[PDB]
Structure formats: C-alpha cells, structure tokens
Amino acid sequence: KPRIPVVWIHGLECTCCTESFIRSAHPLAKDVILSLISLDYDDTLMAAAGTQAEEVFEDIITQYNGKYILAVEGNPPLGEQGMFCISSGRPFIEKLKRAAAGASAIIAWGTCASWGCVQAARPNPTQATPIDKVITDKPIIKVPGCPPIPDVMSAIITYMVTFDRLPDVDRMGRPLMFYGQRIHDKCYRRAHFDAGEFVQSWDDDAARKGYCLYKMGCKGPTTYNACSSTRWNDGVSFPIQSGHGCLGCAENGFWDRGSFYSR
Amino acid sequence: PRIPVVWIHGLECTCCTESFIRSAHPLAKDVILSLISLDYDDTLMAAAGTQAEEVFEDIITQYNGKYILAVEGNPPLGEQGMFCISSGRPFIEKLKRAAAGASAIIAWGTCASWGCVQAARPNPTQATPIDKVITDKPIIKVPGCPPIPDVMSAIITYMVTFDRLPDVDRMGRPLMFYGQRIHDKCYRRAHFDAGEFVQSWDDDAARKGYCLYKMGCKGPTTYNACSSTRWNDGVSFPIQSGHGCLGCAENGFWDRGSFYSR
Amino acid sequence: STQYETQGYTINNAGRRLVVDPITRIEGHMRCEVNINDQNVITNAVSCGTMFRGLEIILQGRDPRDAWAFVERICGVCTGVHALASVYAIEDAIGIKVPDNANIIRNIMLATLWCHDHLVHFYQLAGMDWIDVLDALKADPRKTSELAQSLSSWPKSSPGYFFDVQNRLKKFVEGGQLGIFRNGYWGHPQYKLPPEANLMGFAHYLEALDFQREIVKIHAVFGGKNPHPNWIVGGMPCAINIDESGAVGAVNMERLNLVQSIITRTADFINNVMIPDALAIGQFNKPWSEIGTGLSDKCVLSYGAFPDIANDFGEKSLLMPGGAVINGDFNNVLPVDLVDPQQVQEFVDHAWYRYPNDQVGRHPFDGITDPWYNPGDVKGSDTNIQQLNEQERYSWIKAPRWRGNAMEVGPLARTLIAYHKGDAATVESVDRMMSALNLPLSGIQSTLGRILCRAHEAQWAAGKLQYFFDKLMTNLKNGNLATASTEKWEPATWPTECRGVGFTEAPRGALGHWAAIRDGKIDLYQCVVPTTWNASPRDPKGQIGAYEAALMNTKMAIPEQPLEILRTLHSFDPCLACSTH
Amino acid sequence: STQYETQGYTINNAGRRLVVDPITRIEGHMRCEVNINDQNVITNAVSCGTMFRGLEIILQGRDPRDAWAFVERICGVCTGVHALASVYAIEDAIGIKVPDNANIIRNIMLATLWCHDHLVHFYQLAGMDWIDVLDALKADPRKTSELAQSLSSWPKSSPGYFFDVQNRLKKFVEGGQLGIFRNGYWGHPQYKLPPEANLMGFAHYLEALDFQREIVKIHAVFGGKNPHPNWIVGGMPCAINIDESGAVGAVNMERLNLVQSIITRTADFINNVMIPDALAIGQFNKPWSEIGTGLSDKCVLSYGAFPDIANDFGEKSLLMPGGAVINGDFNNVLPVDLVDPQQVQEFVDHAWYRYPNDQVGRHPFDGITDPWYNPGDVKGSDTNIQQLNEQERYSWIKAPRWRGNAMEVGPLARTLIAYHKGDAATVESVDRMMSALNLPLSGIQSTLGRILCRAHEAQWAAGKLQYFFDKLMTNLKNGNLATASTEKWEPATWPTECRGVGFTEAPRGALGHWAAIRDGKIDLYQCVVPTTWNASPRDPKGQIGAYEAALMNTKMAIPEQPLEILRTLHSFDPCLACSTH
Ligand code: SF4
Ligand code: SF4
Ligand code: SF3
Ligand code: SF3
Ligand code: F3S
Ligand code: F3S
Ligand SMILES: [Cl-]
Ligand SMILES: [Cl-]
Ligand SMILES: [Mg+2]
Ligand SMILES: [Mg+2]
C-alpha cells in the first residue's frame, strides 16, 4: 500500500517544529516516516543536498502533482525582494509557491507558518508573513504553538492518514480537536485561580504549593492549545505545571501583547 | 547493605502489591535489587510453607528493631481471627509479631489504613485497620484503592534517600501526596466553576470533558495525588477517563451513599 | 486413617502428613496438606482457602449501578474482570443493551488483562518453580546469548547483556541479602534447565517485571487507572471525541495512538520473549507433560467470552468458546446454561458455611453466604490448626460442580474446549506447539500443559487486542462514537423485580455473577469464580476438585521441600481472594 | 580569476565552480560554493548563510526579564542555550545572584541539551555521510550481530533483530518511496563501511531517533516543555517541595525520580551505542583524520561553561575550560575576556549589513545590526544568485574574530583547549581514543576528529548530568530548597543604566549575549553564536573562517556529488538560524 507523499519545506524558522515532531511518543516519528507517510522532501533529515535535493523536490512535486501534502515550517520574508530567505539562490517564496501549487492540502506547522511568530514581532525587520497571506487557493490547516505539542503533531498526521480527511477547523483554520478550548479551561491550577490563591513572587510559599500563575503573567485565559490536557513530552509536563505562566505561544501576535510577566 | 523490608498481607485483594510493581521511576525491579532488601513478601518470594516461615522468623530476629514493616490488607476480628489464617493461626498474630520488631510501619492502601471494602457495611468479618490493633509504633498511612504506583515508590525512595519518615498530616498520611484534595488540582475545575457539568453518560458535556460533580464525583472531599501526579506513568486518572472520583483514598468511602449521588 | 475411591483416584490419608502454609507466589491465602506414602508419592491432597471477606453480603442493599466497584475489589490481580461480570449481570437483569464501542472497549479491557496477568504469572509467580535463579550465576554469557538467539529474534541477547544481568544478580546476593530468593529450593533435582537457560529465564523475569507496567496503560486510557479501572452500567464512561471542539476532554486520536503503541509492544514481547521461554521450559521438562493431569483429562469447563456481536452472548458471537466436557468425552462438548438450576451448583458440606441442607448443592440464584467457621476435629485447636480435617469442613472456598461433576477451569480447560469444538486458530496453535515439543496432544493435559496453554492464550489475546482496536477505529471512521446507553440509568426505569447473569472467562477460568434486583436495590448477589472451581473442597460424594486431583499421584523427591506441589498449584495460577470473595 | 595567500592557504578562484544550495542535514539555510582545480581539489571555498530574522533588532525595547523567551527562539535545535545565555547576561547587567539549586538545574538543562543535541547530530544529521544506508541491504544479519557484539555490551544485537531491521528497510525501499534516502550518494567510493557495519549503523540510527525523545523529559520536568523550555531571571521557576503539603504542585520526589531514570538511560545509550559507533566510523575511515583540518591546528576558541560554584564564572568554577589558542601555539592557552573591545569583534565587509566604516570590527557592545542585501554581481540578478561574489558581500553571517584572528569553535576546539590546559579526564579520554584507532594526537585535528570529539563530549555530559543531579539531591537533603532570587525582580530595583555579558559553550561552540539595559528596557542586545564563528565569511584582510579553511585542499572523487563537502561541513554541526539570528 503506497504511503501518502509529504513534502516538508522550511522558510524563516528555528526548526523547533521539526524537533517537536521527532519527539512524538505515539506513533514514534520513526514509525510515521517508515509506515505512515512518505516523507519525500525535508531539508533537516534528507540525504540528498544541493542539486540532488533540487532534483528530488522537482521530481516529487511533478510526479505527485495534486496528491501530496505540503508541510510548511517557518515563513517567507517579503523584505529585500524575499532574499532574507534564499533557497537555490532564489527567494524562498518561489519554492513555497511552487510547492503549494501542486499540494492537495497544506499543514502550517507552528506559530511561524500560522501567524508570524518571533521574526514577525515588532518591528518585523524582514517583513515575515504567514503562509495564508501568500497562498490563498489551497486548504491550510494551522497548527500553532511555539512549537506545537509533539503528540498533537503526530495525532493530526495520523488523523489525516487514517480517516483520509482534513481535521475540522475553527474560524482560524486550527483543528478543533486540539485548539477548541483554552489552556485555562483545562488547567489543573484553576481551583487556585477560582480561590484567589496566586503566586506573587517566584519561589514563594504559593509557588511551592502549585498556586495559580495569573499574577505572574499567565496567558492561559486567552490561549487555545492542548497543553493543560494532552501535556508535553509524553505527558510529562507543561509550562504551568513546571511553574511558569503560559506565554500565549499558540496565539497570533503573542510576543507583542506586553510583558510575559504582566497580567 | 540495603534497608530490610518485611511485607505482609492480611485480608486484601493484592491491588497494592500490583500497584507497586507498576512503578515507572524507579522501576520496581530497581527498588527490589538496589534500594531496599525485600526480605519477606508472600506474593513474590521463592520459599513457601516451612521455608517461608523460617525466612520470616530469621529476618525479624536478625533485623529486630531495624526493618520496615509494610502491611497490605487488614486483620479480621471475627471468628477469633480465623477469617484470615496464616500457618494455621490468626493472621493478627503474625501482624503483631512483625509489628513488634519494626522500626516503622507503612500501611499500604485503604485496607490497611481504614478498612476498605471488607469493612463496608455490614462488615461480616469485623475487618479492622492496622492502627486500631498496633498502637505503639509509627504508622504511615498511604491510602487509596490502591495508592498511585509512583507515589508508593516515591515514599520508599524518600525514606531511603533522606533516611527519615515523611512528614504526615493528623491522620498519618504523607503531606507530600495527601496534603491537597483531588478537586484542588483537577483540570476540569474550570467547568465546575462555570456550572458546566456532565448530566448523563456520553452527553455533549461528557464529550468535551465537563465536570463530573453531578455524576457523583467525590473529588471535593478526597485527598490524594491523582489529579496532579496521575496514574500509570502519568497516562490518566479516573476523572480524565470520564468517571467521577469514588473517594477511594478516604475512610469509609464505600458507605457514603451511591457513587453516583452528589 | 481412611481410604476411598473417587474419579479414578484412591484417596488415602494414612502415611506422613505434609503441610504447606503459607502457599506463596499466589494471590491471597492458601493452605495445602498432603499425605505421602513410603514411596514419597502423594495419596491424599487437601486444598484450603484461608481467607474470607464476604462481598456477597456487603453487596446486599446497594445500588446496582455501584455494584461493579465493590466487586472489582474481589481481586487486584485479575483487576477489571469482576467489574466486567458485574456490568454484564446488571445489564442482563435490567434489560440494557450497550453501544458497539462500549462492547469493543470492554473486550479490549479483558484482552489487556489476559495479556498482563498471564505475563506476570508466567515470570513472577510460576517462573521460579522452573528456573533455578542461583544456577544462573554459573552460566556462560556467550552460551546464553547463543541459546537465546537460537530460540528467538528478540533483540536483547548480547553476551554483554547476559553478563550484565549475571553481575547484577551476583551483586544482589553478595551481601547475603537474598530477599525473594532466600531459602528457596535451588539445587533441587527437579530443576532441569542448564545454567544458560536459567540465566536467559532470569533475564526475561527482569524484562517482564519492567515491561508489564506498560500493558496496563490501555486500562488507564479507557478506565482511568490500573489497578481497579472504572466502568459503568450501560457502557463505559470514556466518552469519545475525535474531531470536535473539546476532544482534549475525551478519548481522542492522541489517546488512541497511545493505545495502539502499547498493543504492538505487548504483542512483540509476548511473541518473542514469553512464547519461546514457555517452549524452552517445555523442552527441558517433558516429564511434567505426564504429571498433574488431574481433572484435565476428565472434566473441563468454559463459559466463553469476548462477545463480538454487541449484547449477544451466544455461540456465534463469543470469540472464546464456551462448553463443558465430562467423563473424558472430548467428542461431546456440551452447552452450558447459567440459569439452569441443575447445572452450576455450590456445595458447602466441606466448607465453612451454613445451608439448610448441606447435602445438596445450590444454584447461585438460590445461593447462601452464611459464614460458619467450624473446623471440627482438627489436630490442634480452632485457632491453631495443625491438621485440617478433610472429612469435615476445611475451607473458606465453596464447592462448585456442574451437573454434579467436578470440573477444571482456566487456560488448559478453554484450550481443550476450543480445540475440540474445532476452533481453527486453537487447533493450529496447539498442534504446532505439541509438534515442536515432540509430544502427543495428551501432553497438554498436565502441569506443563497448563503453562503452555497460558502462554498460547497470551499470544491469542494480544492478537485479539489488535482486532478489537481495528473494529473500534472502523466504527469511528464511520461516525459511530457512542459509548453509553443511558435510557435505563435511572432506577425508576427498572423492573421492580428482575435478575441477571454476567459471565466471562477471566485469566484463571470461568467467572459468573448472579444478581437479583428488587425495589431498586441488590436483593442477592452471588459470585462463583474460577479459583472457587479449581481450589474447591470436596462434595457430599467425596468428589475432589481440580487442585486436589492434580496433586494426586505426584512423586516428591524431597518431602520437606514441596517443589512438586508448588509447581502444580502454581500452574493453575491460584487467586485465593477471588476464590473466597 | 584571482589568487591570494592567507593562513597558509592559497585561495584561488580559477577552475570549475561548484554550488551546493541547499545544504541539507543542517539546521536552517546555507549555501556553499567551491572552486576545484584540474585534480578535483578544492582551491576556494565560500560559506554563505542564506537566512536572517533580526532578533537583535526585535529585542530592543523589551523588558529584560522577557528577553530569554525571545532569544530562545533563535534556535530549536540548541534549544535552551540562548535562554541560559540571556538570563546570565541580564543577571550580569543588573547584579543578580541566583541560588545554588537554580545554578545546578541550569547546568542540568545545558548537560541535557549537550546529550540530546550531540546524539541527534551524530545519527540524524551527520550519520548518512558515513553510513551507506542502501548497502545495509546487502549485509549478513549474523555477521552484523557478530560485529556489534564485538564492539559493545549493548543488549540489542541479535541476528533476528538485524534481520528485522534489514527487512523493514527492504520493504520501505521496495515500492520506490525512498523518502529521506531518495537520490542520495549511496555507492560513492568514499563510503568505506562493510555492509554489516552499515546495517549496524542504520539500526542505531533508528534506535537513536526513538531514544532521543526520552532525554528531553528532563527539560520537561524543570522547564515545562521541550523544545523551548522556560526559565527566569533570578533562577528557575520550577519551585521545589519535597515534604510539605502541596508537593503535588511542585518539583517533588516523584519528579526527581523521573529525572534520575532518564539520566541513567541517557548515559547507557551514549556509552554503549554512540561511543562504539563513533569509534567504528573512525576505524573504517582513518584517512579522514587528515582531511578537513582547517583552523583546528591554528586557532581555536572556548569561552568555558558549567559554573560549578554558583554565580562564579571564573576558571576555578567552570567545569568546561575556556581559553584561546592562536598561531598553532598550543603551549600557550590564552585567557579570554568578553568585555575587552580588542578581543571579540565582528566585521561586515563581506556580509549583508551596514557599518559606518566596514573596514573595522565592532565589539558587541558597539555592535550594529542594519541589514543590507547587497550581493553585487552574482551572475544572475539580486533574486537569482548563480554565483556569489566572495570579493564582496556574500552572507547573512557576520564575521567574528578574536584579537583579529579567525578561530574555530565547538567540540574539537574545546577538546584541544581542555587537553592543552592539562584537564586530566580530557587528556586521558583523548589519548585512549586515539590509541584505540592507532592514530597520533594530531588525528583529532580533522573532520573525523570533530565527530570523535562530539561523541566524547556526549559521554562527558552524561556523566556531568549525574554529578549535577547528585549535587541537587545533596542540597535537598540539607534542607536547601531555594530556586529563585527575587530581590531585584522589580525594575524599580535596577540600575538606570547597566550592561552585562552572558556566555556559555553551546553544543556547537562558544556563545555570547551582550546586553545593555536603560530605563528598564533593552537598549542593545547583540549575539555572537558558535556557527557565526565557524561559518563566518571573510574579513578586510581576506582571512577565511573555519568552514572555508576546512574545505580548502580537499579532494573530491566525483565533483557533481559533494559527499566530501557535506562530510566536513556536517562535522561542525552547522546551525544557520543560530548563526544569523
Ligand atoms: S495557571 Fe494560568 S491557565 Fe492555570 S488557572 Fe492560573 S491563569 Fe489559568
Ligand atoms: S470532576 Fe470532580 S474533582 Fe474535578 S472539578 Fe469536577 S467535581 Fe471537582
Ligand atoms: Fe521555531 S519554527 Fe518550530 S513557531 Fe515560534 S519560532 Fe517557529
Ligand atoms: Fe491493595 S488491597 Fe485491594 S481492596 Fe481497597 S486498598 Fe485493599
Ligand atoms: S506558552 Fe505555549 S506551550 Fe502551551 S502552555 Fe502556553 S500555549
Ligand atoms: S477514586 Fe481513588 S484513584 Fe484517585 S481519583 Fe479518586 S482517589
Ligand atoms: Cl505571531
Ligand atoms: Cl474504609
Ligand atoms: Mg460465591
Ligand atoms: Mg549577532
């Protein structure tokens, strides 16, 4: 049984979403790559470089035109004619558009591809722009977070393969399954919020008992993600559980909503 | 040398021993091989019958005053104690002999701590918790039916590493894991606060993870670590999988009315 | 002393009496007594359950919806199976049908339990009867690696690994703190593995102790926790949401992924570690294919389990066959009906209970649990038993019989029933197994055979786990998400008076709960559990149960060291808390 | 064409020009061009960072307490190291001292990152330059097992395992969907492993891809998540409570038990899989001990890392030594000072940035990040680079120099510095390693050497992880629980104007953040990152950086298949997002 072809491209990014993907505990990234999909192009992991990598790219998007999923990590910069991000000597945006033209659907991994993320924070030196402002004629699934949760990434992939359909999305294009509710709506410290039991300074007695981080700047009340339920790294923790407020990292523009430590 | 531990079993279902072997960190293997000397344990030991009685006697004599005694289950006072018979005598005689030599006693589970299911009405056997029989030794109560595997192992590692008993509340439960209620750290609390409740099984509320209070959840009166530490290497806990807390770490939880009434 | 004949045995209590109390490496409390003749052959065997809690009494007056939680605490080893029997019984009483996904998930819970329980029994409970742990210290690590590699594709077979395991054991015993190995039977002449096989087995003991914790993550996903997961009358409480807002609050794709990853790992361990180890024990201990037969060549019983058609407990639905064989007639697998008062009955003439007439058996719908500790004329006193009196009351276990026959239940029993009903998978698996050992099919009817069948069933169950998961996913792909039926949740909807039977095949055998509901409350709740069958005391005819029969005629090399008694008893995987409840 | 001399090289851009764009199996975006002579030997090498984001610009005007979170997103591969440098820089500016447990935990975070990052680089990034994956399909599984068992005690070495791995690969490739193996260099004459070694390596590639996910569980415990864990100015947010009510809300004994279990597994994997594999790559590729030396015999730089005395960044505290060697004089390790304006400076005469005077180098406290895309004539157009013009501006990477010298940073640099300072563990480890390969000490100064040192460091870090954990537990046993200092958390407590330097050794080399705070906000934030050093373009003297130097003089077998270029560049573990920030 042929595996679904996936082309994974990288714009301006820090590679955290690729790193998150390989952290997947179930299915293991190994098993995704060997058994679930055909990861046919991926700068971070592929053997071929340079002209050989260009040949793979061109062959896959031609042979599987209309039939591959395009995964995009990072974003294109509009500044300097696009030459803030160069691939094969030309603007990354050209490779994005060419890849997007042949895709059946596009997964925008991370807050970078979804919204802009850190490079788009004020004053956005490069005019970094999210994928959906450039590609306007394809289904785009936004999977935001900096990075998204590893097992969320793999669960979205498995859903698409198993059910042969895209996940249903909210009005922003985020999968309902993992972005339908706020962090604060499933936070295990909510009892403390409800009771006015707050950490007021780091490592105070409240902090040592797991009191709410709202007065420390937690953005859980405005942030949609699965961190408080599905959690991180095979359920080991999430930001709040280890004592830091949510930064709001799955939400558009989160770097520019004031200090992480103001409420 | 590793700290000697004598683990005895009264009336029980062996859920606490099973829980212990589920430990993810440290692995029960490593606890047994490297952290303690598990010197008597009916469930796992090679020796049976007279050979098992010799181990029991040798260990409690040679290490008198120096072993930890773990107790799972409880003694029945009915029928002169012969609802639970070991080496042809009442179990309670073995409990008392073991307790007399122990440096400290760990009462694993709601059985040993409080009575659990056999003590529920009408308590046919007159099952009685350890602390009502042994009155002159430190008893650390580790309740739950059973307690959480990594709680059990964390208590053991604390005792070995820090060379001291955990600090306890007024009921003898370790503050570290029993200091707060389930409901004080429950991830569905937002829904409780909002009046967002499951009203019947598999309704739309249940499918979105709403609060189980109206389905009988006893989280608000139950002290344990299930909603934070969680179960089976953090995989789940009762509420996360859609069932209200039964209250299983609390004295008398079987006899507080239906599990499905508020 | 007396002597009488029953079931082809001569029961003779002359001769030296041996007592094994406590029996260890079992769940709960058991005492066993035997008489041996001058040739150190067992001529009498006495099985005694030494504990009782009274769940059947405790359950009176409870809400039927709560019953599963109470009876789940019958046992923590076979955890979940009493909950399953309970919900089946209450649903049968009230007239509730659950949705297909709830049934599939229940089947997953039971298959998961079979895998876990069988695995742990094989290594942690029975294993040390076959593997001489101390002899592992004499092995050559390379020859151990060669042995392992000849038996299996399992990766973990390097000489360095076996040397590391061996050094870990050496360090463990070096201080003289032998722990669970202290005062064992090591060196007994019945230990027949070579040192390399002992080191392989001991390594596997450790791997299994570690790995077993992973299997029950499946229980944690659908049931919240293990031990003692949660269930409901009407289905399961683990609501499913794959593609809607709030899936983070339910069984979603990530939770299902976790389940699939465990299932694959579980199958792999069972198939490449437990299976070849069971075969290896077989290869080095073939004489035990003729020891401990007991009732397994005469009378065997299965109720059947794993209904594949939701709410249909008939023959076409059950994936694990039911049926009864008596008189050694394996050509006539007889149908079992748990409502028929002439079929299952319990006797208490040799048990610590009262009946109005103790010479007759009571079907569980007429069951009585009125405890009466009355050991009569023991050698010793009623609080200091030197010798039980098997001519009178001698156990907390009731004596079940089927149409008056004493039956063996459990993996060997099921395997025989399925084999002889013509279940193709079972025939194939048994045939291939006995062929690899160069033993006739009759070699399964033995203590060795009980062990081989337990490994076979672990492999069977791991395969069924994948089958059930695939069915659940197929329903989800079709938009069929339902996990509970709640139209009869409220007591006002129930019949004023009704009764029901819930049955299944627990790891140790045929399990039944019989419940009567009246005016919204439990009016009667009687359990007959698999170790109640196997560990049964005698009946008014003097007929012996499965353990006592299997122990009959057994040679002991060293009377003071009951290795042969432990081997046979452990082969049935005794659950004494279950037996007495 | 032109030719000039620098650092012992002849830089000559006559001859055929080869372009490799994109460089894959790196983080981020890189282009490399070379010229080769008629003997297919590289005579010119050109390193180009093809991305920029501008974090130094974005950081202006931010709250200094927030800075760590921004700069952490410089890179997701070396995740955490920028956060560590930031909190160090901010604490140095303000005058904050953290509690001992915070320092210990920080050191745990960094050691965990070194373990994880070095492991993934070895297999997933560099490994396929050395292992011919397709040739694994020709291997004999028994001979593979034999090889593995000769090299290591690692358990997973059975012939069946290797056959199963091989069969998985066969089935993967059979339908033509080669995925990440498509259009690789397989069969190139520089692949020198025998088929058995290629199957062993590939199996390990898979085992490492799996195992790596477990190492970062340590970051999840202390830092909430990985990638991109959380930190605070003043310590760490992961408050500790061992023995008081509410330990369920904090780092407690169970959470520490989790960390210990990960540490043990991480050491075992590194020591028994990665280490023997690195040695085996060495044994089969000894000629690469003389290829890619570059600057490693001339100029190497370490800032030092892992302060063991909290808040003391001096020589007696740093567990990983700092120092600089220039002119090949390894007898005089020189002290580094990151405040000295004559030491670290960055040039942009060959980079896409504006300075008022591009012939001078700027220390980071006088740093300027004013992007200027100006490639001049590139044989195409501004949006179509056919050939960079290395006589003018050719990169988004600034050119750092130390006292005007071009330096190499990273594992090989640090190893050389520590060796030549007389660190005993380092001397012993390097001597034993080169002895086992029958190579002189100089063999480390090479592309092969970079890989060997990276493995060595992973082993070093795994050992330091335990050491740090034990130090944490010792404080906890003594009742010292503190994890944060908050005396200067509030901006009203800060100097109106102050500046600070935060430095460490990231997996790829020497990392520094220079920050200036004015009126409660970041006034300047400049980063010089290890790949900025290594991937550096040229300076006003035409001096070449570490990558360009290492590529010089290298023979290519097949010009169109740049395997030799990839091998050397990958040996430095290029992080282009880091380099450009
Ligand atoms: S910690 Fe954050 S998400 Fe949790 S209750 Fe408090 S504010 Fe809400
Ligand atoms: S589910 Fe139970 S414990 Fe959780 S918020 Fe509701 S009532 Fe409280
Ligand atoms: Fe870090 S790529 Fe994996 S979203 Fe925030 S940086 Fe972007
Ligand atoms: Fe763990 S033995 Fe199981 S019943 Fe409730 S604690 Fe008791
Ligand atoms: S910072 Fe991000 S990782 Fe989750 S808890 Fe908040 S959305
Ligand atoms: S039933 Fe028990 S296991 Fe925990 S969630 Fe409630 S205390
Ligand atoms: Cl954004
Ligand atoms: Cl109780
Ligand atoms: Mg009964
Ligand atoms: Mg910079």
Q: Select from B193, B208, B227 the Cβ nearest to the Cβ of A188.
A: B227
User: Ligand 1 pocket test: which of A181, A182, A190, A222 has the largest number of ligand atoms within 8 Å of its C-beta?
Assistant: A190
**The two structure tokens encoding residue A206:** 């409240």
Burial class (CB in 10 A: 0-12, 13-18, 19+), B207: buried
Q: In this structure, is the dihedral angle defined by the CA atoms of residues D464, D466, D472 and D477, taken in order, positive or negative?
A: negative
Nearest CA to ligand 2 atom 7: B213
Whether B69 and B102 have beta carbons less than 8 Å apart is answered as yes
Pick from A122, A223, A237, A249 the residue to mutate for testing the D interface (most D CBs within 10 Å).
A237
Closest CA to A239 of C482, D256, B236, D230: D230
CA dist., res. D343 & res. A156, Å (int): 50
**The two structure tokens encoding residue A94:** 């050209």
Q: Are residues B169 and B90 in the same domain?
A: yes
Nearest ligand to the CA of A110 is 3
Whether B8 and C69 have beta carbons less than 8 Å apart is answered as no
Q: Which residues contact D258 (CB under 8 A, 6 or more apart)?
A: A236, B24, B25, D217, D221
Alpha-helical (H) ranges within C66-194 are: 67-72, 81-94, 100-120, 141-151, 159-174
- CA D269 to chain CA centroid, Å, is 20
**The two structure tokens encoding residue D503:** 């430095």
Q: Are residues A91 and A134 in the same domain?
A: yes
Q: Are residues A92 and A135 in the same domain?
A: yes
CB contacts of D477 in chain B (<8 Å) are 161-162
CA distance to A19, A72, D183, D283, D351, per residue, from A46 (Å): 14, 16, 9, 26, 29
Nearest ligand to the CA of B186 is 2
CA dist., res. C388 & res. A130, Å (int): 82
Domain range for A236: 179-263
**The two structure tokens encoding residue D453:** 């040192």
Whether D538 and D11 have beta carbons less than 8 Å apart is answered as no
Contact B154 D254 (CB under 8 A): yes
**Residue A112 beta carbon below 6 angstroms from any ligand 3 atom:** yes
CA dist., res. C47 & res. C569, Å (int): 10
Contact A87 D21 (CB under 8 A): yes
CATH code: domain of residue D453: 1.10.645.10
Q: Give the domain-ending residue among A117, A150, A178.
A: A178
C304 φψ region: left (φ > 0), alpha (ψ -120 to 50), beta (else): left
Q: Which residues contact C240 (CB under 8 A, 6 or more apart)?
A: B207, C101, C250, C251, C252, C476, C481, C483
Pick from C46, C51, C485, C508 the residue to mutate for testing the B interface (most B CBs within 10 Å).
C51
Q: Please tell me the total count of domains within chain B.
A: 2
Cβ-count burial C498-522 (b if 16+ within 10 Å, e if not): bbbbbbbbbbbbbbbbbbbbeeeeb
User: Ligand 6 pocket test: which of B217, B222, B223, B241 has the largest number of ligand atoms within 8 Å of its C-beta?
Assistant: B222
Position of tokens 């460091």? D457
Position of tokens 């030459």? A83
**Residue A151 beta carbon below 6 angstroms from any ligand 3 atom:** no
Q: Are residues B18 and B69 in the same domain?
A: yes
Q: Give the domain-ending residue among B177, B212, B232.
A: B177
Q: Are residues B152 and B185 in the same domain?
A: no
Q: Are residues B83 and B184 in the same domain?
A: no
Nearest ligand to the CA of A117 is 7
Q: Are residues A104 and A215 in the same domain?
A: no
Q: Are residues B161 and B56 in the same domain?
A: yes
CB contacts of D261 in chain B (<8 Å) are 24-27
DSSP A2: P
**Residue B183 beta carbon below 6 angstroms from any ligand 2 atom:** yes
Q: CA of A180: which chain C residue's CA is closest? A: C245
Neighbours of chain C (3+ CB pairs under 8 A): A, B, D
Radius of gyration from C-alpha coordinates of chain C: 24
CA dist., res. D512 & res. D506, Å (int): 10
Q: Are residues A24 and A149 in the same domain?
A: yes
Cβ-count burial B29-66 (b if 16+ within 10 Å, e if not): bbbbbebbbbbbbbbbbbbbbbbbbebbeebbeebeee
Provide the pairing of β-strand B36-41 with B3-9.
parallel
**Residue A92 beta carbon below 6 angstroms from any ligand 5 atom:** no
Neighbours of chain A (3+ CB pairs under 8 A): B, C, D
Q: Please give the helix or strand (H or E) that residue C211 lies within, else none.
A: helix C195-215
Neighbours of chain B (3+ CB pairs under 8 A): A, C, D
Radius of gyration from C-alpha coordinates of chain D: 24
> Any bridge partners for residue C281, and if so which?
none
CA dist., res. A118 & res. C452, Å (int): 61
Half-sphere exposure of B115 (CA within 13 A, CB side): 20
Closest CA to C27 of B44, B130, B152, B82: B44
Q: Which residues contact D524 (CB under 8 A, 6 or more apart)?
A: D60, D365, D367, D499, D514, D515, D516
Q: Are residues A208 and A173 in the same domain?
A: no
A146 CA: nearest ligand 5 atom: 2
Q: Which residues contact C280 (CB under 8 A, 6 or more apart)?
A: C151, C193, C197, C200, C201
CATH code: domain of residue B208: 4.10.480.10
A227 CA: nearest ligand 5 atom: 4
Q: In this structure, is the dihedral angle defined by the CA atoms of residues B218, B219, B220 and B223, taken in order, positive or negative?
A: positive
Q: CA of B237: which chain C residue's CA is closest? A: C224
CATH code: domain of residue A164: 3.40.50.700
CB contacts of C243 in chain A (<8 Å) are 159, 167-168, 176-177
Domain range for C194: 1-581
Provide the pairing of β-strand B67-72 with A4-10.
unpaired
C76 CA: nearest ligand 4 atom: 3
Q: Pseudo-torsion of CA C389, C391, C394, C395, nearest 10°? A: 150
Q: What is the resolution in angstroms?
A: 1.7
Provide the pairing of β-strand B102-108 with B67-72.
parallel
Q: Are residues A185 and A248 in the same domain?
A: yes
CB contacts of C476 in chain A (<8 Å) are 163
Q: CA of D574: which chain A residue's CA is closest? A: A44
CA dist., res. C91 & res. C515, Å (int): 10
Q: Select from C69, C181, C234 the Cβ nearest to the Cβ of B246.
A: C69
Ligand 4 interacting residues, C-beta cut-off 6 A: B 12-13, 15-16, 72-73, 109-111, 116-117, 145-146; C 73, 76
Q: Are residues A239 and A110 in the same domain?
A: no
Q: Give the domain-ending residue among B142, B160, B177.
A: B177
Nearest CA to ligand 2 atom 5: B189
CA–centroid distance, residue D291 to ligand 5 (Å)? 46
Closest CA to D568 of D270, D289, D248: D289
Q: Please tell me the total count of domains within chain D.
A: 1
DSSP B12: -
What method did the depositors use to determine the structure?
A: X-ray
Whether B151 and B254 have beta carbons less than 8 Å apart is answered as no
Contact C75 B14 (CB under 8 A): yes
